Point group: C3
Chain length 450, copies 3
């Protein structure tokens, strides 16, 4: 049968000490709540009802593109009240899963088991085994069904030794939710309407509640503060790294690896320590990434080596290229196959053709460079003091001598040769050699202050 999700995401998150609401804090570069939305979508949820409240305007700006029903809750009166805000939209004969926007690590796999376990007209409750369950609601089983959730303050001696506790995550059909939520009261020390009370209500109705245990405690943990958030981040990154290792990516140290997006990879890829991969990154076969590299939204071809401390963003690199160390590729950098980019080089919105080399102390911006060019150390593309910024076009087989300025807009045709120290303002023709005529004064017998 069909499925929809309710995600509880209204909290202020006071102990984050932030201007953001609780669920917008990121794990692996995306809001905690976005992790939960994605998991709900992967489960096959038809609708996702997002209960929100605090930091409402920020929620709407940061999650503007999410396919959710925006359910604006004006007051937090407990979890049952929050779910009831979405209940008018539940289909009678769809399953509804309730999830927490501050618990981003919950897995598709655990939730599939939870859904499959739900008996007709009953509830599947997600539980977790703790070595120290003190403070948490104990699961009481009679046969294979949950007959009660007994809170710490009510439990007798034997019940206190129960390690299985309630997580608050559960699945039931939409009609059952509508019926039982209307029967939840707030007669308790907090004066809140607790979703937890659905278990008692289901048992009152001779409906079955079945428990499913989470495989991992971290799977169900939420973050109330940034220390807990960092714990979630580390667990998530380790799990991501472990998956990649098992797929055949050599990550030298999975504790010093960060993925904040998606990684597509070939075979025999090697990633050294302290690499950060962000956005959508594709690495071909036998790509080697050296220590300290940052790759964001990049495509790297087969057999490329990126040497240490290279930072690349929104760039494409052709097969057998060599980049780094200390190379900077800025958005729109497109390096062809067999190119070479070296230390203290910055390439921005430029194409560099096959076999060309830009190996030192150079800025190339808004440029087209052809194949088998030699761009000398200290070369800079620049503009006049004007309005917009124009293009430098360099053909194939061009030699550009060291410390030359290329002043856009300018074109240098195939086979041209430019001497060191030149200022190029006029177009250079095919097979034209341009050399600067210097005037020097030579003074003999100049004794240095020494």
């Amino acid at each position: 049968k069909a499925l929809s999700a309710v995600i509880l995401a209204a909290g202020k998150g006071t102990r984050m000490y932030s201007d953001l609401p609780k669920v917008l804090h990121t794990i692996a570069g995306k809001p905690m709540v976005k992790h939960v939305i994605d998991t709900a979508h992967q489960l096959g949820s038809e609708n996702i009802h997002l209960i929100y409240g605090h930091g409402g305007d920020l929620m709407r700006t940061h999650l503007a593109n999410e396919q959710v029903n925006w359910v604006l809750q004006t007051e937090q009166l407990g979890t049952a009240h929050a779910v009831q805000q979405a209940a008018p939209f539940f289909k009678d004969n769809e399953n509804i899963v309730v999830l927490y926007g501050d618990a981003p690590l919950i897995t598709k796999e655990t939730l599939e088991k939870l859904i499959e376990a739900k008996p007709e007209n009953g509830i599947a409750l997600l539980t977790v085994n703790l070595d120290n369950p003190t403070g948490y609601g104990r699961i009481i089983r009679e046969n294979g069904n949950v007959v009660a959730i007994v809170e710490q303050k009510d439990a007798n001696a034997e019940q206190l030794n129960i390690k299985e506790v309630n997580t608050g995550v559960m699945v039931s059909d939409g009609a059952s939710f509508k019926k039982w939520l209307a029967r939840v009261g707030n007669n308790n020390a907090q004066g809140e309407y607790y979703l937890t009370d659905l278990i008692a209500l289901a048992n009152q109705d001779n409906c079955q509640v079945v428990a499913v245990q989470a495989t991992d405690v971290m799977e169900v943990e939420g973050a109330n503060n940034r220390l807990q958030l960092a714990a979630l981040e580390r667990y998530f990154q380790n799990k991501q790294a472990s998956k990649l290792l098992l797929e055949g990516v050599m990550i030298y140290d999975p504790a010093r690896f960060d993925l904040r997006g998606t990684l597509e990879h070939g075979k025999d890829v090697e990633i050294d320590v302290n690499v950060i991969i962000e956005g959508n990154v594709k690495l071909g076969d036998r790509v080697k990434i050296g220590t300290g590299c940052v790759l964001k939204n990049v495509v790297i071809g087969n057999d490329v080596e990126i040497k240490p401390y290279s930072v690349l963003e929104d760039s494409i690199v052709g097969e057998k290229a060599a980049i780094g160390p200390f190379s900077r590729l800025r958005p729109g950098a497109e390096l062809a196959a067999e190119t070479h980019v070296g230390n203290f080089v910055e390439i921005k919105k430029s194409t560099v053709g096959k076999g060309s080399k830009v190996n030192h102390l150079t800025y190339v911006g808004d440029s087209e460079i052809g194949s088998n060019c030699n761009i000398g150390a200290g070369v800079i593309t620049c503009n006049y003091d004007g309005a917009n910024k124009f293009k430098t076009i360099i053909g194939d087989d061009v030699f550009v001598g060291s410390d030359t300025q290329l002043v856009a807009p300018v074109k240098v045709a195939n086979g041209a040769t430019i001497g060191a120290g030149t200022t190029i303002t006029r177009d250079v023709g095919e097979n034209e050699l341009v050399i600067t005529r210097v005037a020097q004064r030579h003074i003999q017998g100049w004794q240095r202050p020494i």
Copy 2:
């Protein structure tokens, strides 16, 4: 009542294999003994008696400014002998706490409890629970008082199972210390005068000894070698990071964060992996620090982003500035609000005014740059081959073309424009355009070696 401290700091630290004495090795950038001095000061110690010996001259140079009584011990004859060196300076009616200079993690909070627990004319002894107490002196309690410390070699079967052991840290009044230290003997296998024996002596006198348990084993651990020192360092850094996380600083990975000094922070600060903060650093609201940055003695204003692999020292950065990646700020760099400093740029002892940009492959030293200037790629401030190094003064709204050398001392007035490739030796006036007249030789039909 008043309090003074005695810190035992005379050791050679042979297993460090160092020319330094034991307690001068650093944790978080400061000598282990300095941690203990500071803790003693925070407890409210009136006097701090520093028992020193080995590496005496180094102790005096490295701790020259510490408010301690320098008690030079000529021979190490045991801990009681060391404390007795300071005893002539104890006030009869002040409390004295004994601390170890190689155990830097001891907390103010534990020591406050220790002091409060001390009965009149008695001793408060700091103890610690170990899962494997083998080798350590077992605490024997009768009622709530310590009647003996039984060493491993003397303990019977049941005593060996006692997990509570002696740390050697204790508090008693000055008069009691003077009396009991004079009664300590050295009749034991080591031939040493042990401070430990004060417990037996107090019990001989019908004085009460009360135990206080350390909350953490690491709190009382000392470092005898650099492996142990690195364990202390990691524990300390984790604790510092955890405190900052709970205060609302987003530290992406607390295991890859180092603070070696003090950090003042606003709200919503984000610090990526492998950042080192040294000296006194102040970060405003919503500061973002990218991976691999090193900040030492810096003030950063609100809304500044420091991009990866930037190294800043003794510098000030105004609000909404953007620094990095691969930027270097050297001492005396002062960047105004809304400034931009980019890759492979070095700024030393220079002021850069509001809105100005220095984005590539540039050295600016000993300079004043005004507001809304454009400092082109490859620009260098330099000097004549002379004696001292002079200043470059650039006004507001100046454009400096790429690969220009500014030869100090020189002044460039408001609104001036300098063409690329220029050598500026003479002052440039207001609204003056300076462009280099190049002489080039053009040779047609130059066929490259290809």
Copy 3:
């Protein structure tokens, strides 16, 4: 008596998802099998028989220089069959130790104990204690001898609680191996000839089998996939770091330190976080290495400080030199004592004499620079567009002004002074001052687009 080793190294390593065979994957920069070859050599092995198969051509290219007997196995029919391939080469009266090429952490010390424990005409079997021994062959002891290895599926209730299990590593004399290997059958579920069966065969012969327990589980672990490989890497790096710490090297964080080769060190060396040491590196007394440095095949003299994010390869650095931050030394860089190399500087195949400074935004390649030279910011050595690349020779006490190009081949004699912005193509004589005569156009009243 003499010793030889057999190393099992034929596996495909399917779950690595690699074009390499299993044992060529690296730990600390060298193939797993090379670790085991080296350990075998350190034990005093006269012959090392390398059983290989899958990825045969790669094995031969990657291990071409190893002193092993290459035993090419055409089919994997079990571990006994593999060892039997080498058996014709066993001396009757030498001991033979059997090792696994995918278990690189096995120690010399454990193996020495194993060998010493072997009774005449018997076997010493390496075992390991596991908290969860499920799936592994249980060691049955009667007296102090191993009478059986009982597999999981055969063990009774009490045998299943045995924590001691078989590793498959063992020592016996060559004649015993020849005899017993010929009696191993393949009547089991896998249809394989198991080396394990030698224990049963020895007991059949009234020969003694003695167990020796591994000190560490990780010591005997193999890597079947890259997740396991990364676990081995981390354990190995920690152990290496711990050894260095105990020798007196201050490694600020041993979890963020990598050694991939050998390190020779003096006293009071300090290594900050995220340093990688590769190949053969020698550091003198009081060398300080800042964060993010990479040193490969380098010799560093006493009292050198390498500041953060410096990358050095195949280079020598004299005493009291200062390198970094953001410095690049490429192969053949030789820096004398008291030299200074600064940010965004690249030195390649060049010698730099005592006291000389190259502090910013410079490339020096194929050069000899003498003592007490001042190489200004933006200086570049370059070549004509030609064939091979020629040498720049700079004498002692030379000043090279900022943004000067030195066009090889060229010689600059002692005491020469070169003005900023110069292009040097002709040799400069002793005490010759060369300054560029610029032509500038000055336009007054140029109002900037503002």
